Structure 1
């Protein structure tokens, strides 16, 4: 299979035609995506197989072939870029200043950008190109607009 670092679409042929159900990140030989995209199922890459290695429904994250590798964090001050990979459309960078989700367990950065559900798993990056989390788990606010958490894992 292709193991080059980068952003990848997650596709299925179960439904009509070829459908994009989400997106993920290949880094240091590990594939990273949101749990709701794959439901923890195995994936194919060419003639190769990627087996799940770690996942957690509450974090809404899953890694394949090895442990979660992404550990960069939003600085809480600067603009970031969503590298949106929408279904049937070219990868495109969108720059934005995150808002914040305030929870009983601490604050999380959030991006107010609305893409189709199959864009879930697209990476959010800092100015050094480091992945500070994945887009796709969020909430629908008063006005009906979507706001995603910047969801990041823990590197053991």
Structure 2
């Protein structure tokens, strides 16, 4: 329930399959991480509420709450939570995905697959999107994927 960034774990032994953001009582992650499966948190269960394969996003306990967006000029920070590693902030200037439906911020950062769902932050600390859906150019580039509030 508590605000913050979280590992998404699965069970012979445990593995980290992704990362997500708890904000305003709603857990936010990428569809490809959980496929909408229910999530255990302590003794409680988090049930899915909304999901969309094309956006590659899912929310639990309520509607998607994150709505800040990259300003197109400023450096941002990936709050990476790699498997087995302490949460760490990686600052970068996003590039741009140019699409027929408009431009999308993108970060040219390559972390392990279990980092998918890590939040990208603006200077005010607001989550402007999640990391882990992207393209290859041998170098991976992630869209800054933000939902709609």
TM-score under structure 2 normalisation? 0.98
Give the paired residue count. Answer: 148
Distance 2:24 2:44 in 1: 17
Separation (CA, whole Å) in 2 of partners of 1:52 and 1:113: 29
State the SS of the aligned residue for 1:124.
Answer: strand
Is there any run of 5+ residues in structure 1 with no aligned partner, and where?
A: none
1:150 aligns with 2:144: yes
What SS is found at the alignment partner of 1:40?
coil
Backbone CA RMSD of aligned residues: 0.5
Unmatched 5+ stretches in structure 2: none
Map 1:38-77; keep pairs closer than 5 Å. Answer: 38-77=34-73
Which digits, 9 at most, give the CA deviation of each residue in 1:36-57, with x for residues without a partner?
0001110000110000000000
Q: 1:134 aligns with which of 121, 130, 134?
A: 130
Aligned counterparts of 1:125 and 1:54: Cα–Cα separation in 2: 23
In structure 1, what is the Cα distance between the partners aligned to 2:102 and 2:24? 29
Tell me, in whole angstroms, the C-alpha distance in 1 between the residues paired with 2:135 and 2:94. 14
Give, in whole Å, the separation in 2 of the partners of 1:89 and 1:140. Answer: 25
Displacement, 1:17? 1.4
Aligned partners of 1:104, 1:128: CA distance in 2, in Å?
A: 30
Cα distance in 2 for residues equivalent to 1:11 and 1:60: 18
Q: Deviations over 1:49-90 (max 9, x none)?
A: 000000000000000000000000000000000000000110
Deviations 1:116-150 (A, max 9, x none): 01000000000000000000000111xx0110000
Kindly report structure 1 stretches of 4+ aligned residues shifted beyond 2 Å: none
Per the normalisation by structure 1, the TM-score is: 0.94
For residue 67 of structure 2, give the secondary structure of its aligned residue in structure 1.
coil
